[PDB]
Ligand binder design. Structure first.
Ligand SMILES: C#CCOCCOCCNC(=O)CN(CCOCCOCCN(C)c1ccc2nc(-c3cc(C)c(=O)n(C)c3)n(CC3CCOCC3)c2c1)C(=O)c1ccc(C(=O)c2ccccc2)cc1
Length: 126
């Protein structure tokens, strides 16, 4: 099987804006998670071809990753903060749906998810 195309990271038709919450999602939330020692499985789309996972995109029909989220924030793809928060929660849920619960990557995702949730608790006023 081929990999599906990656998620869209830009759309000219979409209006753009710079909100204090969108700045925080990029320069605090993503900045913190990106540099974490456990980021690297989540920094790009799951390459099912390279990793030989013929069932990944039979199970995961809403793929998401931090490389996509990064590009979306850089390209003002997101109007509301909750759109971006929705993409992070999708990335975590996909990892928990596909991988056996005793797997190393499940602990890695939970660590990044704990940090994500602490940084979201500190999001600034709209
Ligand atoms: C022969 C032949 C070819 O030769 C290639 C050589 O490649 C190794 C060298 N790598 C580098 O130079 C770059 N790099 C970053 C990536 O490193 C992770 C190692 O695997 C990379 C590739 N994989 C397997 C690879 C790549 C991407 C993957 N994505 C997934 C995956 C799969 C599924 C099913 C999924 O749901 N998700 C979300 C992601 N996998 C599968 C593995 C994920 C982790 O558990 C094992 C399966 C990936 C595997 C690093 O050097 C590096 C390392 C480790 C850390 C690190 O974590 C650390 C640890 C301690 C202290 C400090 C830092 C940091 C940087």
């Amino acid at each position: 099987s081929m990999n599906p195309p990656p998620p869209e990271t830009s759309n000219p038709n979409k209006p753009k804006r710079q909100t204090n919450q969108l700045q925080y999602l990029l320069r605090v939330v993503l900045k913190t998670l990106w540099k974490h020692q456990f980021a690297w499985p989540f920094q790009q789309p799951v390459d099912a071809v390279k990793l030989n996972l013929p069932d990944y995109y039979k199970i995961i029909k809403t793929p998401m990753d931090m490389g996509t989220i990064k590009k979306r924030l850089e390209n003002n793809y997101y109007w509301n903060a909750q759109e971006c928060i929705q993409d992070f929660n999708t990335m975590f849920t996909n990892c928990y749906i596909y991988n056996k619960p005793g797997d190393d990557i499940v602990l890695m995702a939970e660590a990044l998810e704990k940090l994500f949730l602490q940084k979201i608790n500190e999001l600034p006023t709209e």
